[PDB]
Design a protein around this ligand. Structure first.
Ligand SMILES: N[C@@H](Cc1c[nH]c2ccccc12)C(=O)O
Ligand SMILES: CC(C)=CCSP(=O)(O)OP(=O)(O)O
Length: 345
């Protein structure tokens, strides 16, 4: 059973996650495992009444829920389910938020027997005494069949102040042995996140994110499958020749200085009037790639029964993922809306 009730934040998000586990065709026991894992990772946030304000006005989601879901679609396959969480959200300030986040990661490392050495190497860069925003630590769990998840950690290059974003990023890459990786990154307006794959992965990466305030379709294809990426840009943007977007650049070896993965993240919630339009664009991309567009509709209804045209931001992002030696993947990011539905434009 669950100690959580539907009036508590943890009750709403574990109910959402359980329904999503069924879309992802996870069995009863893996579902129970991951539902409990989500509640544990939230700490005291799980038990917080939804009637109270969000403890932290977090960047993780627009309404400041410390949870976001995502579905990774491969051609011909049922989608893989992942969840992003902020373990330290129910903390009083950013320093304590980070401490609780690292504590949660250490607990996961103990339970699933993986090392935190690589993350440990970076602690002074990303967890200084008086940290700057906008966040301290997020964790993403890939909810794999079998109950042992894939673990990723997200860190803030601006932790030591905005003026040291590139200094921090570059020092982190050097410490990890990726001394040529920075040179492979495109021009950018921000370096909002650095992510690390923890534990078991066929090729664990460091992932560097770049914000582009005014990206064109041509630039997106250049930074990437040029044609695939430009087509995806137009499809999600509804194209108006530049849009806000993020690129992610994945490095899985320290030898060449070349990335092994590229992702274009399009914030479709910023481009459309309501989630009816965003679902339409996501469904069309999935369908055209031979992916499981029916499962997208089932996932949206698993999260919320509201009509899609009654708000915007349920479909937060649609992303096109290229990884050398794998088929393209499309990821749809889906909001919890535990605190607010953003009204349609
Ligand atoms: N909500 C934040 C962080 C975030 C959550 N999910 C994401 C998916 C892609 C890019 C960023 C994010 C943002 O829009 O930046
Ligand atoms: C959740 C955030 C901050 C960014 C989304 S990129 P991701 O971690 O979901 O990328 P992968 O699915 O791990 O390739």
């Amino acid at each position: 059973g669950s100690h959580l009730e539907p009036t508590q934040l943890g009750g709403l998000v574990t109910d959402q996650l359980a329904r999503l586990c069924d879309v992802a065709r996870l069995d009863r026991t893996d579902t129970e495992t991951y539902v409990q894992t989500l509640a544990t990772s939230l700490g005291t946030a799980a038990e917080r009444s939804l009637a109270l304000p969000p403890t932290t006005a977090t960047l993780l989601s627009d309404d400041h829920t410390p949870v976001e879901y995502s579905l990774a679609f491969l051609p011909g396959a049922t989608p893989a389910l992942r969840v992003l969480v902020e373990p330290g959200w129910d903390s009083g300030d950013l320093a304590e938020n980070g401490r609780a986040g690292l504590r949660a990661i250490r607990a996961m490392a103990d339970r699933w027997n993986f090392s935190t050495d690589q993350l440990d190497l970076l602690e002074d860069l990303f967890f200084p005494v008086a940290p700057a925003g906008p966040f301290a630590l997020w964790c993403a769990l890939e909810l794999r069949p079998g109950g042992v998840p894939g673990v990723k950690v997200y860190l803030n290059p601006a932790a030591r102040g905005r003026d040291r974003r590139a200094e921090t990023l570059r020092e982190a890459l050097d410490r990890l042995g990726h001394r040529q990786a920075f040179a492979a990154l495109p021009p950018a307006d921000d370096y909002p996140f650095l992510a690390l794959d923890l534990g078991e992965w066929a090729a664990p990466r460091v992932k560097v994110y770049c914000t582009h305030e005014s990206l064109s379709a041509q630039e997106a294809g250049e930074y990437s499958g040029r044609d695939q990426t430009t087509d995806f840009f137009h499809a999600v943007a509804g194209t108006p020749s530049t849009r806000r977007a993020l690129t992610c650049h994945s490095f899985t070896d320290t030898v060449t200085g070349r990335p092994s993965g590229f992702t274009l993240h399009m914030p479709v919630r910023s481009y459309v009037e309501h989630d009816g339009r965003a679902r339409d664009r996501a469904a069309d991309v999935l369908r055209r790639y031979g992916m499981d567009n029916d499962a997208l509709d089932r996932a949206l209804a698993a999260v919320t029964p509201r009509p899609l045209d009654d708000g915007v931001g349920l479909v937060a992002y649609v992303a096109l993922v290229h990884q050398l030696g794998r088929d393209p993947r499309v990821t749809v990011y889906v909001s919890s809306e535990a605190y607010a539905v953003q009204p349609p434009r």
